[PDB]
Amino acid sequence: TSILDIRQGPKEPFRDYVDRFYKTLRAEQASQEVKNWMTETLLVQNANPDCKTILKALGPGATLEEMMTACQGV
Amino acid sequence: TSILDIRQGPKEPFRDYVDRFYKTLRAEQASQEVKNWMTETLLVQNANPDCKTILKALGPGATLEEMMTACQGV
Amino acid sequence: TSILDIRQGPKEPFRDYVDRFYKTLRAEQASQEVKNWMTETLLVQNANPDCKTILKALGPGATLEEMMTACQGV
Amino acid sequence: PIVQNLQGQMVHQAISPRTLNAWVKVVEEKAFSPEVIPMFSALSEGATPQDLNTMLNTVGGHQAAMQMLKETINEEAAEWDRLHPVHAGPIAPGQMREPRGSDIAGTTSTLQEQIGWMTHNPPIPVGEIYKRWIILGLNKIVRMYSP
Amino acid sequence: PIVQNLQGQMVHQAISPRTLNAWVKVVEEKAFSPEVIPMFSALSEGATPQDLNTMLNTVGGHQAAMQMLKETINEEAAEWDRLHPVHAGPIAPGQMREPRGSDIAGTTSTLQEQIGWMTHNPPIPVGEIYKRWIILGLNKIVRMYSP
Amino acid sequence: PIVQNLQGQMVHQAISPRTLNAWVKVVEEKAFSPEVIPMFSALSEGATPQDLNTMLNTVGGHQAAMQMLKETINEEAAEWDRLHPVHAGPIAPGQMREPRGSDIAGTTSTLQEQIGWMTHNPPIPVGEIYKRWIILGLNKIVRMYSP
């Protein structure tokens, strides 16, 4: 399965999705800079509308514990 | 079971068939040149019509990752 | 169970019978010459008519791989 | 493998059955998963080419992958021979011969020869060259076997 | 087996129970599968004929195959005797006797005799001769037991 | 058992629990099957009479067989005493006493005595004499317990 095919379900907790992401990211062998680009970009983009909304409110500069606690009720 | 008796099912993924082939090829003790001849020949010949069709489009010079990704949807 | 009581079934593969024979032969402690006599004699004698017929066609001088491949379809 | 003895020399010692079985069990359980590569790397510490063919030859199952790897090992070996040409004139009595791709793959070399190269001064890391080919070929597999 | 001791000499040491059991378990699980041959080869590292009969005699089951192997071992042994005739005149006091097919099969030789031949200078590889017969006979079996 | 130490002498060392348990487990699993005899033979390598009674006494179950064996061990022992008469006159101060059937069975001898006989020069193989009685009695059992 390709990294672009990794997406969050409509009922799937973000948490379970983030695990899937760094597992597939774990099978990507690209430069770190590209993998940083993938992190800030693709993760949020394939996140579900309800959490996506939430993550837009965190702004930039956000870290994984704060994202992970931010989308917990969703 | 003989190597000539190894054939791909009508619903069997190629992948599962290629595994069977190099297992049986693994129990053949023939010269490498003969085993090369068996590889390019018998594998495609006993492959199913739908994949067989696919493999004919790869042309010659093809390698196993490209054959294996080529017949994946079949 | 005695070695004379070892016999091949009417539907039993020879192979499964030959295994039984050298297991029971494995519990006989007799001189090698006697055990050679038992091998050429008793094995064929208690073999089933269909295979027995087959084994008669191999003639004498026959070895176990050739007997074992000879009665395979039976 | 080639290990250091108490006396302070490098000598060959055989690999252990529950090491062997641990290699088997990893492959059984985690198939093509990435954790297989660090795992391999740890269990290949101080290992010979000969021991590395032993580990590859003792696999059961996943024969399409095993063939892809073989063919990668030969490609990487063909490439070794290409990049490193044979050297000028006859081999010296005082010296031992340079390896080829097939000596690295363990095929054309004997154990004592594999111990000569590694234990000698300078030593040549024919394990680590095969190891990269294995890891490279492991990447090929992992990338393919991703679904 | 005959192993090298810390002192720097070759001495006999017994084979281990979980090695024995690992041999048993392989046979239980993978029967006639090809992986049995590298597996055998690793577990037969530094092994005696005597230890090789021990391993063959400790099998349970697959008695048709075990008999086919026996008969292959004797054929290969008969062939050893044919190809290598006995040598000219009486055996020297200063020397030890040349092996026959049955000494290679371990049958007519004692352990101390098996250690004499292997440890002596030049050494003779009676393990490796039996090993080929075992591997050859393993091919016979594998080829037959293919379905 | 009596094993060779690093220093290059023969000393007694105790048998291991997972060796003991492996003996137990064999008997549990394969009962009277023939594979028990090579198995026994391997696990009895370098063993004392004392260790051999330990192994026989630690059996549970198959008490008809255990009694048949006992009675075979005593018969074979009675036969040892018959065939080898006691020797002429008093025992020398400079020498140690010849064994009887019951010393071979371990019964009338002490461990240090069992180590004297085996380690001394010439050595006497009281293990191997008991071993044949055990193997002989094992044949009796195997032949009876065939169905």
mmCIF file with all atom_site columns, all heavy atoms in Angstrom, chain A residues 12 14-17 19-21 24 26 30-31 34 38-41 43 45 50 55 63-65 67-69 72-73, unseen atoms left out:
data_model
loop_
_atom_site.group_PDB
_atom_site.id
_atom_site.type_symbol
_atom_site.label_atom_id
_atom_site.label_alt_id
_atom_site.label_comp_id
_atom_site.label_asym_id
_atom_site.label_entity_id
_atom_site.label_seq_id
_atom_site.pdbx_PDB_ins_code
_atom_site.Cartn_x
_atom_site.Cartn_y
_atom_site.Cartn_z
_atom_site.occupancy
_atom_site.B_iso_or_equiv
_atom_site.pdbx_formal_charge
_atom_site.auth_seq_id
_atom_site.auth_comp_id
_atom_site.auth_asym_id
_atom_site.auth_atom_id
_atom_site.pdbx_PDB_model_num
ATOM 1   N N  . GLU A 1 12 ? -12.994 6.518  12.530 1.00 0.00 ? 12 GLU A N  1
ATOM 2   C CA . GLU A 1 12 ? -11.734 6.009  12.991 1.00 0.00 ? 12 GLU A CA 1
ATOM 3   C C  . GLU A 1 12 ? -11.005 6.974  13.882 1.00 0.00 ? 12 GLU A C  1
ATOM 4   O O  . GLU A 1 12 ? -10.876 8.118  13.437 1.00 0.00 ? 12 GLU A O  1
ATOM 5   N N  . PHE A 1 14 ? -8.194  9.273  15.202 1.00 0.00 ? 14 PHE A N  1
ATOM 6   C CA . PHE A 1 14 ? -6.985  9.848  14.685 1.00 0.00 ? 14 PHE A CA 1
ATOM 7   C C  . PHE A 1 14 ? -5.777  9.127  15.063 1.00 0.00 ? 14 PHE A C  1
ATOM 8   O O  . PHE A 1 14 ? -4.931  8.778  14.303 1.00 0.00 ? 14 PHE A O  1
ATOM 9   N N  . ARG A 1 15 ? -5.755  8.823  16.360 1.00 0.00 ? 15 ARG A N  1
ATOM 10  C CA . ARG A 1 15 ? -4.726  7.979  16.996 1.00 0.00 ? 15 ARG A CA 1
ATOM 11  C C  . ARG A 1 15 ? -4.444  6.677  16.189 1.00 0.00 ? 15 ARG A C  1
ATOM 12  O O  . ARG A 1 15 ? -3.252  6.297  16.068 1.00 0.00 ? 15 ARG A O  1
ATOM 13  N N  . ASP A 1 16 ? -5.477  5.971  15.711 1.00 0.00 ? 16 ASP A N  1
ATOM 14  C CA . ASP A 1 16 ? -5.278  4.730  15.068 1.00 0.00 ? 16 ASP A CA 1
ATOM 15  C C  . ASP A 1 16 ? -4.661  4.927  13.600 1.00 0.00 ? 16 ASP A C  1
ATOM 16  O O  . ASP A 1 16 ? -3.717  4.271  13.156 1.00 0.00 ? 16 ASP A O  1
ATOM 17  N N  . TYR A 1 17 ? -5.113  6.012  13.047 1.00 0.00 ? 17 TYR A N  1
ATOM 18  C CA . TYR A 1 17 ? -4.575  6.648  11.855 1.00 0.00 ? 17 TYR A CA 1
ATOM 19  C C  . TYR A 1 17 ? -3.142  7.201  11.875 1.00 0.00 ? 17 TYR A C  1
ATOM 20  O O  . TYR A 1 17 ? -2.426  6.949  10.942 1.00 0.00 ? 17 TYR A O  1
ATOM 21  N N  . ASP A 1 19 ? -0.818  6.097  13.925 1.00 0.00 ? 19 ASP A N  1
ATOM 22  C CA . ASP A 1 19 ? -0.086  4.818  13.981 1.00 0.00 ? 19 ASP A CA 1
ATOM 23  C C  . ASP A 1 19 ? 0.142   4.191  12.658 1.00 0.00 ? 19 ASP A C  1
ATOM 24  O O  . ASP A 1 19 ? 1.194   3.815  12.280 1.00 0.00 ? 19 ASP A O  1
ATOM 25  N N  . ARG A 1 20 ? -0.961  4.152  11.847 1.00 0.00 ? 20 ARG A N  1
ATOM 26  C CA . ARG A 1 20 ? -0.844  3.692  10.431 1.00 0.00 ? 20 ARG A CA 1
ATOM 27  C C  . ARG A 1 20 ? 0.084   4.508  9.580  1.00 0.00 ? 20 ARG A C  1
ATOM 28  O O  . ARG A 1 20 ? 0.923   3.998  8.805  1.00 0.00 ? 20 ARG A O  1
ATOM 29  N N  . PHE A 1 21 ? 0.068   5.830  9.793  1.00 0.00 ? 21 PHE A N  1
ATOM 30  C CA . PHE A 1 21 ? 0.928   6.771  9.088  1.00 0.00 ? 21 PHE A CA 1
ATOM 31  C C  . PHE A 1 21 ? 2.366   6.569  9.358  1.00 0.00 ? 21 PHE A C  1
ATOM 32  O O  . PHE A 1 21 ? 3.101   6.321  8.339  1.00 0.00 ? 21 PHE A O  1
ATOM 33  N N  . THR A 1 24 ? 3.605   3.139  7.764  1.00 0.00 ? 24 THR A N  1
ATOM 34  C CA . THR A 1 24 ? 3.871   3.322  6.315  1.00 0.00 ? 24 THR A CA 1
ATOM 35  C C  . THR A 1 24 ? 5.027   4.238  5.977  1.00 0.00 ? 24 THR A C  1
ATOM 36  O O  . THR A 1 24 ? 5.900   3.912  5.106  1.00 0.00 ? 24 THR A O  1
ATOM 37  N N  . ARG A 1 26 ? 7.426   4.588  8.101  1.00 0.00 ? 26 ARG A N  1
ATOM 38  C CA . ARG A 1 26 ? 8.517   3.650  8.494  1.00 0.00 ? 26 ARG A CA 1
ATOM 39  C C  . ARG A 1 26 ? 8.989   2.823  7.272  1.00 0.00 ? 26 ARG A C  1
ATOM 40  O O  . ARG A 1 26 ? 10.154  2.519  7.127  1.00 0.00 ? 26 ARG A O  1
ATOM 41  N N  . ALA A 1 30 ? 12.739  7.715  1.624  1.00 0.00 ? 30 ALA A N  1
ATOM 42  C CA . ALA A 1 30 ? 13.091  9.160  1.262  1.00 0.00 ? 30 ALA A CA 1
ATOM 43  C C  . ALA A 1 30 ? 13.896  10.020 2.219  1.00 0.00 ? 30 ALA A C  1
ATOM 44  O O  . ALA A 1 30 ? 13.976  9.778  3.429  1.00 0.00 ? 30 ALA A O  1
ATOM 45  N N  . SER A 1 31 ? 14.601  11.066 1.712  1.00 0.00 ? 31 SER A N  1
ATOM 46  C CA . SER A 1 31 ? 15.347  12.036 2.493  1.00 0.00 ? 31 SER A CA 1
ATOM 47  C C  . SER A 1 31 ? 14.445  12.636 3.602  1.00 0.00 ? 31 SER A C  1
ATOM 48  O O  . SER A 1 31 ? 13.231  12.656 3.618  1.00 0.00 ? 31 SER A O  1
ATOM 49  N N  . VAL A 1 34 ? 12.094  15.532 2.898  1.00 0.00 ? 34 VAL A N  1
ATOM 50  C CA . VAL A 1 34 ? 10.899  15.085 2.233  1.00 0.00 ? 34 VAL A CA 1
ATOM 51  C C  . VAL A 1 34 ? 9.851   14.394 3.136  1.00 0.00 ? 34 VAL A C  1
ATOM 52  O O  . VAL A 1 34 ? 8.668   14.675 3.107  1.00 0.00 ? 34 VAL A O  1
ATOM 53  N N  . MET A 1 38 ? 6.088   15.440 4.157  1.00 0.00 ? 38 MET A N  1
ATOM 54  C CA . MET A 1 38 ? 5.036   14.494 4.256  1.00 0.00 ? 38 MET A CA 1
ATOM 55  C C  . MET A 1 38 ? 4.303   14.517 5.549  1.00 0.00 ? 38 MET A C  1
ATOM 56  O O  . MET A 1 38 ? 3.076   14.416 5.624  1.00 0.00 ? 38 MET A O  1
ATOM 57  N N  . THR A 1 39 ? 5.021   14.643 6.621  1.00 0.00 ? 39 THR A N  1
ATOM 58  C CA . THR A 1 39 ? 4.483   14.816 7.973  1.00 0.00 ? 39 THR A CA 1
ATOM 59  C C  . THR A 1 39 ? 3.578   15.981 8.124  1.00 0.00 ? 39 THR A C  1
ATOM 60  O O  . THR A 1 39 ? 2.363   15.794 8.435  1.00 0.00 ? 39 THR A O  1
ATOM 61  N N  . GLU A 1 40 ? 4.041   17.201 7.847  1.00 0.00 ? 40 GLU A N  1
ATOM 62  C CA . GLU A 1 40 ? 3.178   18.359 7.992  1.00 0.00 ? 40 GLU A CA 1
ATOM 63  C C  . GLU A 1 40 ? 2.063   18.447 6.996  1.00 0.00 ? 40 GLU A C  1
ATOM 64  O O  . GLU A 1 40 ? 1.110   19.168 7.090  1.00 0.00 ? 40 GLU A O  1
ATOM 65  N N  . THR A 1 41 ? 2.193   17.780 5.889  1.00 0.00 ? 41 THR A N  1
ATOM 66  C CA . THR A 1 41 ? 1.240   17.921 4.805  1.00 0.00 ? 41 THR A CA 1
ATOM 67  C C  . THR A 1 41 ? 0.244   16.875 4.756  1.00 0.00 ? 41 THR A C  1
ATOM 68  O O  . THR A 1 41 ? -0.953  17.162 4.813  1.00 0.00 ? 41 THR A O  1
ATOM 69  N N  . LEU A 1 43 ? -0.586  14.012 6.461  1.00 0.00 ? 43 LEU A N  1
ATOM 70  C CA . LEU A 1 43 ? -1.257  13.645 7.688  1.00 0.00 ? 43 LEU A CA 1
ATOM 71  C C  . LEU A 1 43 ? -2.587  14.459 7.896  1.00 0.00 ? 43 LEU A C  1
ATOM 72  O O  . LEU A 1 43 ? -3.666  13.945 8.098  1.00 0.00 ? 43 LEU A O  1
ATOM 73  N N  . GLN A 1 45 ? -4.156  16.560 5.696  1.00 0.00 ? 45 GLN A N  1
ATOM 74  C CA . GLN A 1 45 ? -4.891  16.450 4.455  1.00 0.00 ? 45 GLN A CA 1
ATOM 75  C C  . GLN A 1 45 ? -5.746  15.189 4.433  1.00 0.00 ? 45 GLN A C  1
ATOM 76  O O  . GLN A 1 45 ? -6.952  15.244 4.049  1.00 0.00 ? 45 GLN A O  1
ATOM 77  N N  . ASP A 1 50 ? -14.058 16.210 10.741 1.00 0.00 ? 50 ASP A N  1
ATOM 78  C CA . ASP A 1 50 ? -14.285 16.654 12.100 1.00 0.00 ? 50 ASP A CA 1
ATOM 79  C C  . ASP A 1 50 ? -12.986 16.976 12.788 1.00 0.00 ? 50 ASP A C  1
ATOM 80  O O  . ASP A 1 50 ? -12.815 18.042 13.351 1.00 0.00 ? 50 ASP A O  1
ATOM 81  N N  . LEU A 1 55 ? -7.659  20.449 13.888 1.00 0.00 ? 55 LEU A N  1
ATOM 82  C CA . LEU A 1 55 ? -6.292  20.596 13.608 1.00 0.00 ? 55 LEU A CA 1
ATOM 83  C C  . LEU A 1 55 ? -6.028  21.918 12.955 1.00 0.00 ? 55 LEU A C  1
ATOM 84  O O  . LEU A 1 55 ? -4.993  22.538 13.182 1.00 0.00 ? 55 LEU A O  1
ATOM 85  N N  . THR A 1 63 ? 2.890   20.107 18.014 1.00 0.00 ? 63 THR A N  1
ATOM 86  C CA . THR A 1 63 ? 3.584   18.840 18.120 1.00 0.00 ? 63 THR A CA 1
ATOM 87  C C  . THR A 1 63 ? 2.657   17.661 18.406 1.00 0.00 ? 63 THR A C  1
ATOM 88  O O  . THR A 1 63 ? 1.429   17.777 18.453 1.00 0.00 ? 63 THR A O  1
ATOM 89  N N  . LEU A 1 64 ? 3.182   16.464 18.237 1.00 0.00 ? 64 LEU A N  1
ATOM 90  C CA . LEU A 1 64 ? 2.297   15.276 18.196 1.00 0.00 ? 64 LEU A CA 1
ATOM 91  C C  . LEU A 1 64 ? 1.453   15.012 19.441 1.00 0.00 ? 64 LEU A C  1
ATOM 92  O O  . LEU A 1 64 ? 0.252   14.702 19.273 1.00 0.00 ? 64 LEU A O  1
ATOM 93  N N  . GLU A 1 65 ? 1.934   15.129 20.638 1.00 0.00 ? 65 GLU A N  1
ATOM 94  C CA . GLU A 1 65 ? 1.132   15.044 21.864 1.00 0.00 ? 65 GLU A CA 1
ATOM 95  C C  . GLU A 1 65 ? -0.016  16.043 21.853 1.00 0.00 ? 65 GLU A C  1
ATOM 96  O O  . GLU A 1 65 ? -1.130  15.738 22.114 1.00 0.00 ? 65 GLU A O  1
ATOM 97  N N  . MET A 1 67 ? -1.412  17.383 19.069 1.00 0.00 ? 67 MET A N  1
ATOM 98  C CA . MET A 1 67 ? -2.378  16.963 18.047 1.00 0.00 ? 67 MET A CA 1
ATOM 99  C C  . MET A 1 67 ? -3.151  15.785 18.553 1.00 0.00 ? 67 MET A C  1
ATOM 100 O O  . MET A 1 67 ? -4.362  15.617 18.299 1.00 0.00 ? 67 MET A O  1
ATOM 101 N N  . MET A 1 68 ? -2.491  14.854 19.170 1.00 0.00 ? 68 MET A N  1
ATOM 102 C CA . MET A 1 68 ? -3.087  13.611 19.606 1.00 0.00 ? 68 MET A CA 1
ATOM 103 C C  . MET A 1 68 ? -4.067  13.841 20.706 1.00 0.00 ? 68 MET A C  1
ATOM 104 O O  . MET A 1 68 ? -5.197  13.376 20.614 1.00 0.00 ? 68 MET A O  1
ATOM 105 N N  . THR A 1 69 ? -3.737  14.635 21.705 1.00 0.00 ? 69 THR A N  1
ATOM 106 C CA . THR A 1 69 ? -4.778  15.130 22.692 1.00 0.00 ? 69 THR A CA 1
ATOM 107 C C  . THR A 1 69 ? -5.821  16.067 22.105 1.00 0.00 ? 69 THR A C  1
ATOM 108 O O  . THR A 1 69 ? -6.947  16.188 22.633 1.00 0.00 ? 69 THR A O  1
ATOM 109 N N  . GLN A 1 72 ? -8.815  13.846 20.358 1.00 0.00 ? 72 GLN A N  1
ATOM 110 C CA . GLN A 1 72 ? -9.320  12.724 21.198 1.00 0.00 ? 72 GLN A CA 1
ATOM 111 C C  . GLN A 1 72 ? -10.802 12.514 21.325 1.00 0.00 ? 72 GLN A C  1
ATOM 112 O O  . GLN A 1 72 ? -11.215 11.379 21.351 1.00 0.00 ? 72 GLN A O  1
ATOM 113 N N  . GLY A 1 73 ? -11.642 13.524 21.381 1.00 0.00 ? 73 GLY A N  1
ATOM 114 C CA . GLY A 1 73 ? -13.085 13.306 21.493 1.00 0.00 ? 73 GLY A CA 1
ATOM 115 C C  . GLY A 1 73 ? -13.805 13.014 20.210 1.00 0.00 ? 73 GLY A C  1
ATOM 116 O O  . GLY A 1 73 ? -14.950 12.535 20.249 1.00 0.00 ? 73 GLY A O  1
#
